[PDB]
């Protein structure tokens, strides 16, 4: 994985150039947003189960998905989806802290479409649940940091769809 | 294949319910972006060979691949690589016009990774070549429609990996 600091360093290293004015300004922008990222992560950490609770309630609960015939019927498959969204929120927080979506591609989205197709997991229903996370996280954390989290949650959605 | 209109119809059809206001807003969003999509398609269609020209020059030319021993040494291989990027650009415009990545998962990606593995074609290089297309397409058309084109070109990159 690489964060925003490493991404600037790698790009400068590939060129074989010292950290120039453009590179320094990219770092300064991250250090300015660093206080916003840490505080946001602490809010998500405290209300980790709470976000997933109100995400399933909005989108998934009291639908054909929960009812027999649906994918998220059994307690085994329910706890699986809870865990999935717990994983999705946590990895979105990692990418939010890092300032790069490199961790999402490496550890989450690497053959996630092929996995979900084989099991028979609905893509549209999962996307809606991550969309439900986004709205819950934005209402909890704030406007600017909620937007920041919303980018990487869209990045999970785009890689899944 | 499915377009953005057919996708929201099929989602309502599978549930067996009439198109509601929330599903109607998905259509209205497409009918708002439709003028932007048609205009974008006209620009890329005009500079179809021209977009590839710059993309190969930015990424592929004067590298390992074109040099003897590489996968783009012979003229037959080189012409096939142009043909492949001509394919990728043409189908990305189809998916842009449709407003759904259904055609890409049908005619572009579904049985492409297996062929590229078997022929000995480097996927890591061709992804960078599509990323080279993405940068040329966005610069030619615009930031609004180039982002739209970007998603479907990224979709091909995700399917290849």
């Amino acid at each position: 994985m690489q964060d925003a600091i490493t991404a600037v360093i790698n790009s400068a290293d590939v060129q074989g150039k010292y950290l120039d004015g453009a590179a320094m300004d990219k770092l300064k922008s991250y250090f300015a947003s660093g206080e916003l990222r840490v505080r946001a992560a602490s809010v998500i950490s405290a209300n980790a189960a709470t976000i997933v609770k109100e995400a399933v309630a909005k989108s998934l609960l009291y639908s054909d998905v929960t009812r027999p015939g649906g994918n998220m019927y059994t307690t085994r498959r329910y706890a699986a989806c809870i865990r999935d969204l717990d994983y999705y929120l946590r990895y979105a927080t990692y990418a939010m802290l890092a300032g790069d979506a490199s961790i999402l591609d490496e550890r989450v989205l690497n053959g996630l479409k092929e996995t979900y197709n084989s099991l028979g997991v609905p893509i549209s229903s999962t996307v809606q649940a991550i969309q439900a996370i986004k709205e819950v996280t934005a209402s909890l954390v704030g406007a600017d940091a909620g937007k920041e989290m919303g980018v990487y949650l869209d990045y999970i959605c785009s890689g899944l769809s | 294949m499915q377009d953005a209109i057919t996708a929201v119809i099929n989602s309502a059809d599978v549930q067996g319910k009439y198109l509601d206001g929330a599903a109607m807003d998905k259509l209205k969003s497409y009918f708002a972006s439709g003028e932007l999509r048609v205009r974008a398609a006209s620009v890329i269609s005009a500079n179809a060979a021209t977009i590839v020209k710059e993309a190969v020059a930015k990424s592929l030319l004067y590298s390992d691949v074109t040099r003897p021993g590489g996968n783009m040494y012979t003229t037959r291989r080189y012409a096939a690589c142009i043909r492949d990027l001509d394919y990728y650009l043409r189908y990305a415009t189809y998916a842009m016009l449709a407003g759904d990545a259904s055609i890409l998962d049908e005619r572009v990606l579904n049985g492409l990774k297996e062929t590229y593995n078997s022929l000995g074609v480097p996927i890591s290089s061709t992804v960078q070549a599509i990323q080279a297309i993405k940068e040329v397409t966005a610069s030619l058309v615009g930031a609004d429609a180039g982002k739209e084109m970007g998603v479907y070109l990224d979709y091909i990159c995700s399917g290849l990996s």
């Binding site: 994985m1 690489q2 790698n10 790009s11 590939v14 060129q15 074989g16 150039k17 790069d100 979506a101 490199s102 999402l104 591609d105 490496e106 990045y155 | 990424s59 592929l60 030319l61 004067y62 590298s63 390992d64 691949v65 480097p122 890591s124 290089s125 061709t126 992804v127 960078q128 080279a132």
Partner: peptide, 20 residues
């Protein structure tokens, strides 16, 4: 994402032109 610029791509050193 995660893919580096120097995996399967020719890297040109972006230098400021001599007229600049």
């Amino acid at each position: 994402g995660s893919l580096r610029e120097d995996i399967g791509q020719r890297v040109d050193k972006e230098v400021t032109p001599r007229f600049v």
